[PDB]
Write a protein that binds this ligand. Structure first.
Ligand SMILES: O=C(O)c1ccc(C(=O)O)cc1
Ligand SMILES: O=C(O)c1ccc(C(=O)O)cc1
Ligand code: NA
Ligand code: NA
Ligand code: NA
Ligand code: NA
Lengths: 445, 445
């Protein structure tokens, strides 16, 4: 009776159809049928992303592709645990309030100017998003933005409160492209091609440094009237208490080890997934230093995304085991040889940068990263490029709300019009397809 | 400065000490030192049970016992997922309120007699604990018990209102011994020795059927004055609404497949961990039938216990890989050959039935199930008996509060005295050491 129950029944139909009617070797048929089923279920979201994630292995198992335990072992990939480490580190500095003090101390560095207010609100929302989350950084910044934009309260003077709102809703998403913790897509790419933390930082941090100015510029050079106004610094100030310095010390030490993981590990006996060990060590320090309780981390952690990761890796392996990756490589051979690698990575970047407006950031990465990384592997090219590209572009949702939670968080402020966002995002999208295809060309040799 | 920070530093000391001073082959030294370390950390709970669980693999990995991915793969054992299935099934019937309707419908079957009120309160707390939880069943029953024991309000007539509180807090723990879902210890045993759902039911359900009467009898023939009183059925009645019949249908179907798993699976192609597939199927049906949302399952699920399961299996494998199981088997060879299997399982049943009063039921199972199962395996005896025994006896916490959450839940009713419980529990413990050593002898050939 409900829309989604219908999308589900239509997808079951589509599967049965493709299964019986496709004229290929059985394994390719099964792999294609499964790929389509999941693709639909994840783009429509008729079932929750996490339930479809759980649906992947139970199919693999019933259709004999894998044995139950082999299929489940995917959900314990080391990147999943690294991400759980970043979740506990965020839980820590939130329960401790080190995000509030990092907001105030930087925000009150601007003495009383709305000019240098919003610029620090974006630089903070971004710097905080590198480590915490996106939905969380945006929902945490919203009160500080509405707090600042209350002196210029005139909402007949609207264009101030869209520049300063959409700015943070974008600064959180751009800040999520800086490190392996931040947005799930990065983790799905890292799990697919086997990236370390410092590897994905060598990629994403440059792209974030470039895209945050370009995005503020684009919001600016629409309708910005904010070189005027004054500050209302209204609330109790902050002060470093029972080891907010401890939370900082652990955080700092952890991020240090994450950056210098390559030489420390090489000069330690070369452990297997050093970054994951560091993340679990973080959880341990944070628990021994008494600084955060487990109930906190259990609330903060989005276990549904951790299950998603696994479902995505399982899908990748289903495509390999069934040969659907080699089959699609053969089917695209003539197209990719008639196109350039420029053309290709432009088509990819565009396709995702716009698909992410209609569907979930992570659902889109979870679908496209496997397919592309595995086809690229069937072409015998290093899948890193396509995977990182897709993962970055999936976090470039700027048009309508519903694209990402930050958009619908700053949108529910009953002020910003649908059309305004729909056309600033339409400019920033092309801007990114540009910046991305550029950098992806420079990171070649 | 804090108690637990000291317990931790003293345990790190104990480890370093045992490590340097024990005079055995290096692997046995490392395995023993680790066993002691974890043992302490889990019995004292200086760190949260789940943080110790995470501590097990990071040690195994740094001390070269396993590779990071091998050690982590333990956290994706199929029993973990079966338990997550039972968590989603509980989330479903709680969010749906089918536990309230099952309480009301049975409670209002007793017309107006306090005699047949408390007896049905115990039969319900027990039947519900089979599937839901223990801490949860107790906290959900407390308002219904205080609701009934409000007509006999006289708390100078205390021993009525203590009998029914301790009564239900015991019916929850005994009901937790009936099925693989219920109490984690059962799941840790099932994960260690490889039990199916219908296997652990063939064991525990008899024991619960026996132990619930014996426990009501023992509470009765202390100070029971309840053949008097009348009922106050005060609250809005219940009625089967938007598919509480659906939730019932799925529940029933799931439990049916779990019971009949052996022939269905044999007559299906013999899938590997069928019960786990049934549990994930439950999560899927419950999501397609729209009957429960994922946010609900994410709140209900105790992800910390699911991580514990894994850490405990990892410990077991550390004992095997280091040969500490064979070493302790050799060290106990003369003791166990000078003892009978009666003597042995009496010492075990006693030891745990009383250790479980001082430390967490599941922390106790996670520690003792590995050590014992693996030593029994070095003696080449089927480890099932000792493991199931330990798991049942660990759920036989009846004395002080703090033993189990149900005890401390009915204890916080600012009414039941410390001494009263300490001596009903002191009788019920021996009663169990009896019943258990008995049944454990009958289940031999
Ligand atoms: O799929 C989505 O819509 C999505 C999920 C998570 C995040 C994040 O917190 O980084 C952003 C977007
Ligand atoms: O470790 C404990 O004290 C304990 C944990 C869980 C349960 C349960 O809900 O079955 C009972 C007791
Ligand atoms: Na982030
Ligand atoms: Na999106
Ligand atoms: Na139970
Ligand atoms: Na206990």
């Amino acid at each position: 009776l409900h829309r989604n129950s219908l999308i589900v029944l239509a997808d079951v139909a589509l599967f049965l159809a493709l299964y019986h009617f496709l004229p290929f070797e059985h394994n390719v048929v099964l792999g294609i049928s499964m790929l389509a089923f999941i693709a639909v279920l994840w783009l429509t979201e008729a079932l929750h992303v996490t339930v479809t994630a759980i649906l992947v292995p139970v199919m693999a198992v019933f259709f004999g592709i894998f044995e139950t335990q082999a299929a489940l072992n995917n959900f314990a990939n080391s990147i999943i645990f690294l991400f759980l480490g970043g979740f506990a580190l965020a839980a820590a500095m939130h329960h401790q309030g080190l995000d509030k003090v990092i907001a105030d101390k930087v925000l009150a560095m601007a003495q009383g100017k709305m000019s240098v207010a919003v610029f620090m609100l974006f630089g903070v929302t971004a710097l905080l998003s590198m480590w915490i989350s996106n939905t969380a950084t945006a929902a945490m910044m919203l009160p500080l933005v509405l707090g600042v934009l209350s002196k210029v309260d005139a909402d007949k003077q609207r264009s101030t409160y869209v520049f300063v709102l959409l700015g943070v809703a974008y600064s959180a998403s751009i800040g999520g492209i800086a490190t392996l913790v931040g947005s799930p897509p990065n983790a799905i790419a890292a799990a697919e091609v086997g990236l370390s933390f410092t590897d994905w930082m060598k990629f994403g941090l440059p792209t974030a440094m470039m895209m945050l100015p370009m995005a503020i510029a684009i919001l600016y050079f629409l309708l910005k009237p904010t070189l005027n106004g004054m500050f209302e610094l209204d609330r109790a100030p902050v002060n470093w208490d029972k080891g907010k310095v401890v939370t900082l010390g652990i955080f700092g030490l952890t991020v240090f080890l994450w950056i210098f993981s390559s030489p420390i590990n090489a000069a330690l006996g070369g452990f297997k997934s050093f970054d994951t060990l560091v993340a679990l060590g973080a959880i341990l320090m944070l628990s021994f230093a008494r600084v955060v309780h487990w109930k906190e981390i259990q609330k903060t952690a989005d276990w549904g995304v951790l299950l998603l990761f696994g479902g995505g890796l399982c899908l990748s392996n289903v495509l390999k085991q069934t040969g659907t990756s080699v089959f699609l490589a053969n089917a695209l051979s003539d197209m990719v040889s008639h196109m350039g690698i420029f053309v290709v990575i432009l088509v990819v970047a565009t396709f995702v940068v716009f698909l992410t407006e209609f569907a979930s950031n992570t659902a889109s990465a979870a679908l496209l990263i496997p397919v592309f990384a595995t086809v690229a592997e069937a072409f015998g090219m290093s899948p890193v490029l396509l995977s990182v590209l897709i993962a970055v572009a999936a976090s470039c949702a700027f048009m309508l709300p519903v694209a990402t939670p930050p958009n619908a968080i700053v949108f529910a402020s009953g002020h910003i019009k649908q059309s305004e966002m729909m056309r600033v995002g339409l400019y920033l999208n092309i801007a990114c397809i540009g910046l991305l295809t550029a950098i992806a060309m420079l990171f070649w040799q």
